[PDB]
Paper text:
The PotD-PotABC protein complex in Escherichia coli, belonging to the adenosine triphosphate–binding cassette transporter family, is a spermidine-preferential uptake system. In general, ATP binding, hydrolysis, and phosphate release trigger conformational changes in the transporter, leading to the uptake of extracellular polyamines. Here, we report structural details of the polyamine uptake system PotD-PotABC in various states.
The overall architecture of the apo PotABC complex, consisting of two PotA subunits, one PotB, and one PotC, adopts an “inward-facing” conformation, as observed for the type 1 ABC transporter. In this complex, the two PotA subunits are assembled as a homodimer and located entirely in the cytosol, whereas PotB and PotC form a heterodimeric transmembrane complex, with both proteins contributing six transmembrane helices arranged with a twofold pseudosymmetry. Despite a sequence identity of only 21.9% between PotB and PotC, their tertiary structures are overall similar, with a root mean square deviation (RMSD) of 3.97 Å for the 247 pairs of Cα atoms. The only notable variation lies in the periplasmic loop 2 (P2). PotA, the cytosolic subunit of the complex, contains both the nucleotide-binding domain (NBD) and the regulatory domain. In addition, it interacts with the “coupling helices” of PotB and PotC through a cleft located just beneath the inner membrane. In the apo conformation of the PotABC complex (state 1), the PotB (D226 and K241) and PotC (Y219) form the plane interaction network to enclose the PotABC translocation pathway at the periplasmic side.
Numbering used by the authors:
A (entry chain A): 15 to 374
B (entry chain C): 5 to 253
C (entry chain B): 7 to 279
D (entry chain D): 16 to 373
C-alpha cells in the first residue's frame, strides 16, 4: 500500500539544478533511511515532502490525494529538526500541546493525550520543567514527543541523533526502532552515518548529486553493490583488475587477475577480451605465513605494517605490481600460532564464491 | 584597584553637575556660586510660575507620545526585517544606518525647509513628526539585535505544526520581544527629553517647550526655579522608568 | 502584511529624510530673494563667498575643536569599554544603564551647571586652593578648553556603547593563541585587537564628530564671541538674517565629511570579513 | 623526565576539579589523555600551556621551574580546537606571526615558513585568507603555525573532532608520521577510544580528575585494572564467580553462576571470596542445534540478531536473566552457519582467554 509517491520532481535553486529528476515511492509501515555524502540533497527531499518548499515540476500524492500545492499547514506530515526547534518561553507541557491546542481539540482530552505521549518518551517527571534546564537527549526526546502527538501518517527526521555522544546515541537508536514498531507509522531518516543506517533501517536509499543510486535491504546494499561508488561508500573494499580468458561452466569463469590466473563466479553473459572488476572486502582475505618456501600458493605480496585497533588487527600487504591490499582480522594475543611476522614474502588467498564481480 | 578608580572617575565626571544643581536648588544665593544656608523659597516661587510648568508638561507629553509611536513603528519594521529573508535586507540596513549617522543641524534645516514649502504652520505636529523621525532608528536596531538571540527554525516548526502567520506573532515572536520593546520605549523617552537643536529649529510660538524657555531666560539670567524643576522631573522620570520595567516584567 | 510595513517605512523615510536632503542640496544653487526665499536662477555666488578669510577661519577652528573632542572621547572611552567587559555578567546592565540617567535632565541645564562648577570664583578652585595644589584661581571660561570639555561631557556616552558592542563580540581563543605564540599585551593590542574593532571606532567617531559641530549652545554659553562653530553661523543665517542659500551651502561641507566617513566605514567593514 | 607534575591542585569557584595529580612525560613519545566528558583534561592542557595558574604544586621542564613563568616565555605551543586562525592576515603571516615576536632576522623567516608549509603540503596556498579554505586546510595551517617555533612539546586539544570519517583516518597517520619525523613529544586530548588505541604510545585514562590507569594500549585494552576501564573501551561481559574451593596454584575452581567452570587466577585467593570474571564479546562461542532440548551447557535465549554489517551480535539470556552479548563475523556464503531464533544454545570460552579481577 503506497503512502507517498513522488513522480517527476525537479528542483532548481538559484539557477543550479540540485535535483534534476526523482521517482520514488514510499510504502506503509517501514523505517526508511536516506544516505549519501554531504551536498546530495536529502534535506531538500525532506522539505518538499513536508511542504516547506515548492516544486518546479512533478506531483506528490498521499493516499491517492494530491497535495503538491497544499500549504504546509494542512498536510498530515510532521518533522523533527536538528536543533530541536524548541520554544524557550514555554514548558514541556506547552511545547507538546502546542499542536493540539491549534486543531480545535476539546479541552477535556488535551491533558491525557500529552501526558501519555510523554510516557512513550519517558519524561513523566519533567512535564512542568522549562527548557534550558534539560540535557540534549531530553530536548531531543521533547522534540520527538511534540512531533508524535498529532498522530501523522509520516514522521520525518533530519539528523536527530547527530549531536550526542556514543552510548546515549546507541541507546536512542534501539529506543527509536522500538517506538516505530510500537506506533505503526512510517519513518524517514536522513543521516550521514553508515552503521546507524545499517542498524535500524528496513530500506536504504543512497543519493548522490540528486540521483538515486540503490534502493534495497541492508543486506542487498552491503553484500550486493551495483556500482563502484556504492561499494566504496559503505565499509572498505579492495579493487582488483581481471581479464576474462574463457568460461568453464555455468557459474565459473577463468580470468587473469593481477598477472595470475584464478577462478571466479560470474553470472551475466561474458565474452573473451572483456575487462571485469573483482571487489573483495578485507574480512574475506586469508593471508598465510611463508617462512622458508612454505605455503607459497596464490597471489604473492609483502606485508609492510601491522596496526592494532584493539578489537581487530589491521594489516597492509604490498603486491608485486605495486597495488596496496588491506586485510582485516581479529586479535587473539593468547593464541600460539599468531603474532608478528614483520617482513617476509606473503601469500593471499580467499574462500571461493565470496567475490563480488562487476562489469566494465 | 586602578580599574575601579578610572571607572569611578569617569562616573564622577559625568555626574558632578547634577549634584551641583540639586544642592543649589536648596541654596540661598541667587547666582549659586557659594553656599549661604538652606532655604525652601525656590520651590514656593516655582510653584507660582505658569509658563515654566506649561513648558515642562508639554515636554513630558511630547516625549511620551513620540516614544509610543516610534516604538510601535520600529518594532513592526524590525519584525518585518527579521521574519522575511530577501536580498534587499542589506539595503534597508544601510538606509537605516545612513539615517542614523546624520547631523542634527542638517536634519533640522531640511525639515524646516520642507514644512515651510508644504505650507504647514510650525507647532505640535512638526515637533512630533521630527521627534518620531529622529527616534526611529534606535528602536529598530534594538529589536533587530535582540531577535537573533534565538533560532530561526522555530517559525518553521510552528508552520509545520499548523500555525498561521497571525498566530506566530502573537504566541512566539511577541513573548520574546517584549523586553526589547520596553528598552526601546525607555531609550526613545530619554532622547526626546534632551534634544535642543531640532526642537529649537522646528518650534512655533503656539507651543512652548522647556529648552526654549531656558534659552530665553539665559540671556537675562536663570533662577534656582530651574533647579527645582530639574530635580522634580528627575524624581518623576525615576518613578516612570521603574513603573515601565515593572509593567514589562 | 509582508510588504505593507516595508512600503510604510520606505515612504516615511523618503518623505522625511532624503527628499528634504535633495531639496536642500539644490537650494545652494539658487539666488537670494526677499519674497519667497528662492529665485530660480542657477548661480555659484554662494560657494565662492565661503573662500573669504572671515568665513573660512571659523570652519578650521570648529574642525580643530571637533577633532580634539573626538580624540579625547576615544582615549577616555576605549579603556572604559575594555574594563567593563572584564566584569561579572550580573552587573553589566546596571552600569551600562547609569550612563543614560543624566540624559533625563535637559542638556542646556547641565551645561549651565558645568559652567557654574568651573567658574573662577566657584567650586573646583576654592576646593583646589583650600587643599594646597594650585597657587592661583584657574581661568578656563571663554577659551577652547571649556568648549572641548563641554563637548566631551555631553557626547561621551554616545561612543562607549559601539566600542563595548565590538569588544564583547570578540573571540576569546583568538587572544589566547596570540598570548601562547609569544605576544605581550602591547603587540596583541596593536596587531590583533585594534584591527578587529575598527568598525566600532569609526561608528563612535561618526557619532561624536558630526554632532559636535552643530552644538551652538555650548559655544554660546562657554565659548564666547571668538569661539564659534558651524551651528552658530547656520542658526544666524536661518533665523535672523534669513539668507537660506548661505546656510544650504554651508551644510554641504558637513555632508561631505559624513559621506567620506561612511565610505571609510564601508571599506573597513568589507576588509574585516 | 621532560614535564613532571607533583601535587597539582586546581579549584574552580570553590569546586575541585584536580584533587591530586602526579604525572611524568618522557621525551620523544606520543601521549593521549582519554576519558568521558568533564574530567579536567583540558584544565591540565591549559596549565601546561600556561593559560591558567595552579593553586599548589610544581611544574618543570629540564629541571627548571615554570610554576609562575607566564605563557609568553614558555617553550610550549598548543593547537586549538576551533582553529583560531586570525582572519585579517594571510597564511604566510599567520605562520610567521610567531617568528616576528622572537626578533628573528628577516633573512630566515621566509625559508622557515616555506619549509613548515612544505611539511604539511601547503605550498600553493601560500597567500589565501583563512576563509577560502576548507576544514582540513585550516587544521594543517594551525598545525604548521604551532610547529614553526620548534617547541619542546606540542599540545593538541580535540584537533580532528570536526572532520569527516575519511579525512580523519588519513590525518591520524599523517600526524603519527609527522611526530616520528620531527622528534618532539605530543600530548593529545580526545574522547574517542579508537584514536587513542591506534595513534598513541602511552594512554592515561582520567575520570573526575583522577588517573585510573596509565600504560601502553595493549595493557590498557587487554589487562584492565578495575571495572571502569574494562567497559569504557569496548563492550565487556561481567560474570560473578564465587569461589567455594581451590584446586591448585593457578587452576581455581569457581562456581560461575551455578555452573562448573574452572579458570586461571594469577594471585592468591581464599575459599569464599568473590571474583569477577570478564570476557570480551568476540571471545565467546555458540552452538546451534535444531532440537528444542537444552544441553551442551547453560540456557540459551536470543532477543534479536543485530546485523551491523561487518559483525553480527546475538543476545544470549541465561537462567539467571543476564545478557551475554556475543559478537562474531558474518560470513554469509556458508553451508552450515545461518542463524536460527529462539533456540536453546550454549556459551563457552577458549580456556583462559578471560580476565579475572578481585
Amino acid at each position: 500500500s503506497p503512502l507517498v509517491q513522488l513522480a517527476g520532481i525537479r528542483k532548481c535553486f538559484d539557477g543550479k539544478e540540485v535535483i534534476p529528476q526523482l521517482d520514488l515511492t514510499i510504502n506503509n509501515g517501514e523505517f526508511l533511511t536516506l544516505l549519501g555524502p554531504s551536498g546530495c540533497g536529502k534535506t531538500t527531499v525532506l522539505r518538499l515532502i513536508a511542504g516547506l518548499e515548492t516544486v518546479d515540476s512533478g506531483r506528490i500524492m498521499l493516499d491517492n490525494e494530491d497535495i503538491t500545492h497544499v500549504p504546509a499547514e494542512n498536510r498530515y506530515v510532521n518533522t523533527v529538526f536538528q536543533s530541536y526547534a524548541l520554544f524557550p518561553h514555554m514548558t514541556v507541557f506547552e511545547n507538546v500541546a502546542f499542536g493540539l491546542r491549534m486543531q480545535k481539540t476539546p479541552a477535556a482530552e488535551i491533558t491525557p493525550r500529552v501526558m501519555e505521549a510523554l510516557r512513550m518518551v519517558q519524561l513523566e517527571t519533567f512535564a512542568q520543567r522549562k527548557p534550558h534546564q534539560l540535557s540534549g537527549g531530553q530536548q531531543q526526546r521533547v522534540a520527538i514527543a511534540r512531533a508524535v502527538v498529532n498522530k501523522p501518517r509520516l514522521l520525518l527526521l533530519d539528523q536527530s541523533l547527530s549531536a550526542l555522544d556514543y552510548k546515549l546515541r546507541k541507546q536512542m537508536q534501539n529506543e527509536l526502532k522500538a517506538l516505530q514498531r510500537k506506533l505503526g507509522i512510517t519513518f524517514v531518516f536522513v543521516t550521514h552515518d553508515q552503521e546507524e543506517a545499517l542498524t535500524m533501517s528496513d530500506r536504504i536509499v543512497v543519493m548522490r548529486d540528486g540521483r538515486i543510486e540503490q534502493d534495497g535491504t541492508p543486506r542487498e546494499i552491503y553484500e550486493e553493490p551495483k556500482n563502484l561508488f556504492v561499494a566504496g561508500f559503505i565499509g572498505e573494499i579492495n579493487m582488483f583488475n581481471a581479464t576474462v580468458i574463457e568460461r568453464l561452466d555455468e557459474q565459473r569463469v577463468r580470468a587473469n587477475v593481477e598477472g595470475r590466473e584464478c577462478n571466479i563466479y560470474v553470472n551475466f553473459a561474458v565474452e573473451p577480451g572483456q575487462k571485469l572488476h573483482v571487489l573483495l572486502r578485507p574480512e574475506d582475505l586469508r593471508v598465510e605465513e611463508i617462512n622458508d618456501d612454505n605455503h607459497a600458493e596464490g597471489l604473492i605480496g609483502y606485508v609492510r605494517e601491522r596496526n592494532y585497533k584493539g578489537m581487530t588487527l589491521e594489516s597492509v600487504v604490498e603486491l608485486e605490481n605495486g597495488k596496496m591490499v588491506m586485510v582485516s582480522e581479529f586479535f587473539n594475543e593468547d593464541d600460539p600460532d599468531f603474532d608478528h611476522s614483520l617482513d617476509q614474502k606473503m601469500a593471499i588467498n580467499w574462500v571461493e564464491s565470496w567475490e563480488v564481480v562487476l562489469a566494465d | 584597584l586602578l580599574r575601579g578608580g578610572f571607572m569611578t572617575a569617569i562616573y564622577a565626571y559625568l555626574y558632578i553637575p547634577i549634584i551641583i544643581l540639586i544642592v543649589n536648588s536648596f541654596n540661598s544665593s541667587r547666582f549659586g556660586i557659594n553656599w549661604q544656608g538652606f532655604t525652601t523659597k525656590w520651590y514656593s516661587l516655582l510653584m507660582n510660575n505658569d509658563s515654566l510648568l506649561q513648558a515642562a508638561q508639554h515636554s513630558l507629553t511630547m516625549a511620551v507620545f513620540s516614544a509610543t509611536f516610534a516604538t510601535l513603528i520600529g518594532s513592526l519594521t524590525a519584525v518585518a526585517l527579521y521574519r522575511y529573508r530577501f536580498r534587499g535586507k542589506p539595503f534597508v540596513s544601510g538606509m537605516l544606518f545612513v539615517v542614523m549617522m546624520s547631523p542634527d543641524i542638517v536634519m533640522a534645516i531640511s525639515l524646516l525647509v520642507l514644512f515651510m514649502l508644504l505650507g504647514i504652520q510650525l507647532g505640535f505636529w512638526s515637533l512630533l513628526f521630527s521627534h518620531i523621525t529622529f527616534c526611529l532608528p534606535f528602536v529598530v536596531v534594538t529589536v533587530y539585535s535582540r531577535l537573533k538571540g534565538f533560532d530561526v527554525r522555530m517559525l518553521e516548526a510552528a508552520k509545520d505544526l499548523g500555525a498561521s502567520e497571525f498566530t506566530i506573532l502573537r504566541k512566539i515572536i511577541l513573548p520574546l520581544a517584549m523586553p526589547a520593546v520596553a528598552a526601546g520605549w525607555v531609550l526613545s523617552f530619554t532622547l526626546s527629553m534632551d534634544d535642543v537643536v531640532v526642537s529649537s529649529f522646528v518650534t512655533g510660538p503656539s507651543y512652548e517647550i522647556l529648552p526654549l524657555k531656558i534659552y530665553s531666560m539665559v540671556k537675562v539670567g536663570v533662577s534656582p526655579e530651574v533647579n527645582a524643576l530639574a530635580t522634580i522631573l528627575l524624581v518623576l522620570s525615576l518613578v516612570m522608568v521603574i513603573a515601565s520595567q515593572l509593567i514589562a516584567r | 502584511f509582508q510588504n505593507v510595513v516595508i512600503v510604510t517605512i520606505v515612504g516615511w523615510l523618503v518623505l522625511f529624510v532624503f527628499l528634504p536632503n535633495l531639496m536642500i542640496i539644490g537650494t545652494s544653487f539658487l539666488t537670494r530673494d526677499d519674497a519667497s526665499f528662492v529665485k530660480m536662477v542657477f548661480t555659484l555666488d554662494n560657494y565662492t563667498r565661503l573662500l573669504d578669510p572671515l568665513y573660512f577661519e571659523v570652519l578650521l577652528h570648529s574642525l580643530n575643536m571637533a577633532l580634539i573632542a573626538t580624540l579625547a572621547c576615544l582615549v577616555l572611552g576605549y579603556p572604559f569599554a575594555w574594563f567593563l567587559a572584564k566584569l561579572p555578567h550580573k552587573v553589566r546592565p546596571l552600569l551600562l544603564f547609569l550612563l543614560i540617567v543624566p540624559f533625563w535632565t535637559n542638556s542646556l541645564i547641565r551645561i549651565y551647571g558645568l559652567k557654574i562648577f568651573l567658574s573662577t570664583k566657584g567650586y573646583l578652585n576654592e576646593f583646589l586652593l583650600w587643599l594646597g595644589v594650585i597657587d592661583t584661581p584657574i581661568r578656563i571660561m571663554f577659551t577652547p578648553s571649556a568648549v572641548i570639555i563641554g563637548l566631551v561631557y555631553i557626547l561621551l556616552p554616545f561612543m562607549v556603547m559601539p566600542l563595548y558592542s565590538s569588544i564583547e563580540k570578540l573571540d576569546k581563543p583568538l587572544l589566547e593563541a596570540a598570548r601562547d605564540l609569544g605576544a605581550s599585551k602591547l603587540q596583541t593590542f596593536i596587531r590583533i585587537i585594534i584591527p578587529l574593532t575598527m568598525p566600532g571606532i569609526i561608528a563612535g567617531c561618526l557619532l561624536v564628530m558630526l554632532p559636535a559641530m552643530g552644538l551652538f549652545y555650548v559655544s554660546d554659553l562657554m565659548g564666547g564671541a571668538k569661539n564659534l562653530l558651524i551651528g552658530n553661523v547656520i542658526k544666524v543665517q536661518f533665523l535672523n538674517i534669513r539668507d537660506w542659500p548661505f546656510g544650504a551651502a554651508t551644510s554641504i561641507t558637513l555632508t561631505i565629511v559624513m559621506g567620506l566617513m561612511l565610505l571609510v566605514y564601508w571599506r573597513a567593514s568589507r576588509l574585516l570579513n
